């Protein structure tokens, strides 16, 4: 044991706690100046004592050497697409189809309702708590290595916030750029002759495709986790909301506007409440993503492969 | 010009006409003995005058040398999957979802209704009328070269029945084995010590995976074309039924039980009529495949990629 290895560990633990509070809780216990005082106190010391520097330290978010092309990554568990509804009557028909397709319909049919961010789908792996690999969605089967670019996102933890993290946990989420960040960026490109971005979706996509993390660092990107992929060494809850609540408690950013709605009548109330809030969110939203909250019912219903909406195989019973 | 090149052309034209009548029309103009008389009259002569032998002659269906492993084939146009319904109430919900999803709902909503064969999905290419390539469905993106095995199917034309065939036409269909053929096959395996087949679906799959066409030739397989892929040099009709009627007129086998039904009430009548006929068809059927007959409405509705049945992105209007 030494006083400096004790100081480094203390600073790291504090700075991660301050980052959880600022980014995930939206409730920092200290001013930004305090957070920064300790940030460069740590950074200075790691450089004065290189032997005690760790790859997941809050000061090592940015890789100094720019990359020379992205590498392909075959996703273990596939990244699926989403079905879409464009009306109250169309949404109610999708529910009635599930109501019959199920073996037993519970009296309250609970749904985890969330806003649909206009963002880029990614998959982030965490091995024994620390971030080792990040990748784009791509076609769903294959994507690209955006690890050094995901590492630069201030609200993405480099280390999960738990003493017993799982063996391997894949966090699935959408990268996006909020309005303030988007407006600040286009002023800078205008003040320093360079291309401006059309809308926040394109700025985020363009920032993620950068091969120099130092550019990405300057881009004001943000993550919001929507699901889970690989889950080794853990017993994930039996509802989607609770799995989301669980990610929030281990250090991952999740959208605060997520709610549970019992049946289509309540779900339509949520869709309407978010449609009026569109004007005061601080980020873009295409709509609402609605999901069957019970995971057993999700595994009962299942998926549907690339297939027409104009054809159906109405099968016979035994 | 010579009398023998004139004889060969005449025999080929006649034998193809007799095959259309026997296999596609189910109405042969002559007895099987007449068809066979001419078959080996042609075969004998092609062998007495090898120089005038063609690769698409009715006598060259079977390749004499067995293959040494199948080659992979990347499908140009993808081969999609099918959605499924398990009840009257579930089917009506799928219709109501289409009724709203469309911009304009026609008064009569016509559907091309057909029986669902329990068969193996294939893709057959015809270049300037003659059969050049056949392939399995596989994952949808990639399949296997079963050209020499498809060539052996008595009801699959080696040459389209038209003086102006299209540039490239991909016929999409299901290979299956009828009951008589299936019962005759298992008696032969029992009488000559070999594995029997569980049901017609497995016998057909096992026959298609043979690398020696001579085995496939002996297996009593059959094709029924359900759709079209590549379509160069032709203006395909604006309805699914008419495209099917068109395949029937150029020499391809299509199921005779296919009918047009106006609206869900009539479609349910068809589903019921086929459910009672199950007992007297002479081949297996899992159910009924129902399709929106108008091709414009098909291109309006579109497809849906690998995606959950338990989730939906209810988007906002402009
Ligand atoms: C100078 C400076 C330092 C830090 C921040 C934001 N911030 C604050 C905290 C905090 N308050 O605990 C934690 C992480 C973080 O990213 C800004 C905007 C500017
Ligand atoms: C001996 C023999 C010859 C032909 C057939 C069946 N058949 C008949 C015709 C025909 N009638 O025009 C055309 C093609 C064909 O496949 C069988 C069952 C047995
Ligand atoms: C970018 O795509 C999405 C966004 C938000 C979601 O909740 C998603 N939920 C699921 C299940 C899937 C496949 N995609 C999602
Ligand atoms: C073996 O799969 C099928 C069988 C019958 C059909 O009509 C099909 N119709 C379509 C459009 C598709 C994608 N698959 C089909």
From Swiss-Prot, chains A, B:
Binding-site residues for NAD(+), renumbered to this chain: 32-36, 81-82, 114, 137, 174, 291, 315
Active-site feature positions: 116 (n6-amp-lysine intermediate)
Protein's UniProt keywords contain Ion transport: no
Swiss-Prot/TrEMBL keywords: DNA damage, DNA repair, DNA replication, Ligase, Magnesium, Manganese, Metal-binding, NAD, Zinc
GO terms of molecular function: DNA binding; DNA ligase (NAD+) activity; metal ion binding
Cellular component, GO annotation: cytosol
GO BP term, example: DNA repair
Keyword Manganese listed: yes
Leader sequence residues: none
Family: Belongs to the NAD-dependent DNA ligase family. LigA subfamily.
Function of the molecule: DNA ligase that catalyzes the formation of phosphodiester linkages between 5'-phosphoryl and 3'-hydroxyl groups in double-stranded DNA using NAD as a coenzyme and as the energy source for the reaction. It is essential for DNA replication and repair of damaged DNA.
Descriptive protein name: DNA ligase
Organism phylogeny: Bacteria, Pseudomonadati, Pseudomonadota, Gammaproteobacteria, Pasteurellales
Gene name in the database record: ligA
Residues of the full protein shown: 1 to 318 of 670
């Amino acid at each position: 044991m030494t006083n400096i290895q004790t100081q480094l560990d203390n600073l790291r633990k504090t700075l991660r706690q301050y980052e959880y509070e600022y980014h995930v809780l939206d409730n920092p216990s200290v001013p930004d100046s305090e957070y920064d005082r300790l940030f460069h106190q740590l950074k200075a010391l790691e450089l004065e004592h290189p032997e005690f520097l760790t790859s997941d330290s809050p000061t090592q978010r940015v890789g100094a050497k720019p990359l020379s092309g992205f590498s392909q990554i075959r996703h273990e568990i596939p990244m699926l697409s989403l079905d879409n509804a464009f009306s109250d009557a169309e949404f109610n028909a999708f529910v009635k189809r599930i109501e019959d397709r199920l073996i037993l319909l519970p009296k309250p049919l609970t749904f985890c309702c969330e806003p649909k961010l206009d963002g880029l789908a990614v998959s982030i792996l965490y091995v024994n708590g620390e971030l080792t690999q990040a990748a784009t969605r791509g076609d769903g089967t294959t994507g690209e290595d955006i690890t050094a670019n995901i590492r630069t996102i201030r609200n993405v933890p480099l280390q999960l916030l738990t003493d017993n993290p799982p063996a391997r946990l894949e966090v699935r989420g959408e990268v996006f750029m909020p309005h303030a960040g988007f407006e600040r960026l286009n002023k800078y490109a205008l003040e320093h002759n360079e291309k401006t971005f059309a809308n926040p979706r394109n700025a985020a996509a363009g920032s993620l495709r950068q091969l120099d993390p130092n550019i990405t660092s300057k881009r004001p990107l943000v993550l919001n986790a929507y699901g889970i992929g690989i889950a080794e060494g853990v017993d994930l809850p039996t509802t989607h909301y609770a799995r989301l609540q669980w990610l929030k408690s281990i250090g991952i950013p999740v959208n605060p506007e997520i709610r549970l709605c019992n049946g289509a009548d309540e779900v339509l109330g949520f869709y309407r409440d978010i449609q009026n809030k569109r004007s005061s969110l601080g980020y873009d939203i295409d709509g609402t993503v609605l999901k069957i909250n019970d995971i057993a019912l999700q595994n009962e219903l299942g998926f549907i492969s690339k297939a027409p909406r104009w054809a159906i195989a109405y099968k016979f019973p035994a």
